[PDB]
A paper describes a structure:
Here, we isolated a salt-induced PR-10 gene from the halophyte Halostachys caspica and named it HcPR10. Like the structures of other PR-10 proteins (Aglas et al., 2020; Morris et al., 2021), HcPR10 was composed of a seven-stranded β-sheet (β1-β7), two closely connected V-shaped α-helices (α1-α2) between β1 and β2, a long C-terminal α-helix (α3) and eight loops (L1-L8) connecting these structural elements. HcPR10 formed a pinecone-shaped structure, with the twisted seven-stranded β-sheet and the long C-terminal helix forming the top surface of this structure and the curved V-shaped helices forming the bottom.
Inside the pinecone-shaped structure was a large cavity mainly composed of hydrophobic residues that may favor hydrophobic ligand binding. The cavity also contained several hydrophilic residues, allowing water molecules to bind inside the cavity in the apo-form structure. The cavity had a volume of ~1,339 Å3 and contained one entrance located at the surface close to the top of the pinecone-shaped structure. The entrance was surrounded by the long C-terminal helix, loops connecting α2, and β2 (L2), β3 and β4 (L4) and β5 and β6 (L6). The entrance was approximately 5.9 Å wide and 16 Å long, which was large enough for the internal insertion of a small ligand.
Author numbering: 0 to 161
Write the structure that this text describes.
Amino acid sequence: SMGVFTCTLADITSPVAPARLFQAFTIDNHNLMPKVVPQFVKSIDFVQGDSTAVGCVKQINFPADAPFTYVKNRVDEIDASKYYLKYTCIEGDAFPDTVEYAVYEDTFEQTETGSRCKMVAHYHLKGDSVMKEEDVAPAKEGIQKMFKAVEEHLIANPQLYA
């Protein structure tokens, strides 16, 4: 349409090993996130499939607090060896007002300090749809807090996903 805005929703260096963060955020998040971060994630249900796999669809439901209610994420590519997942939001109200279509890539990279986690959004914008930092800062801030809580859980539970 008007174009694509690609932006980094999270760039987070962590002492936790990348295989473990990958499992927590992309593979087993439907179990972990409602337990560990209920203030950000009410529940996650499989709309299609019953395990994280290419083609599955997970619906993430946000608390009443949240400015949006839900998102349906279709998993299009998984490269577990590279700790990489790509999904497409096929339905939901979590978009910045002016987004026709949104694609996300969650990547975890091995570093010397531990991991570097990058979550990248590709926002396809409608005709003359203005977009500003204030439109994505709430998501950026919420994601950092979620990561913080998940990181602490994995530190406190060193064998989980090891």
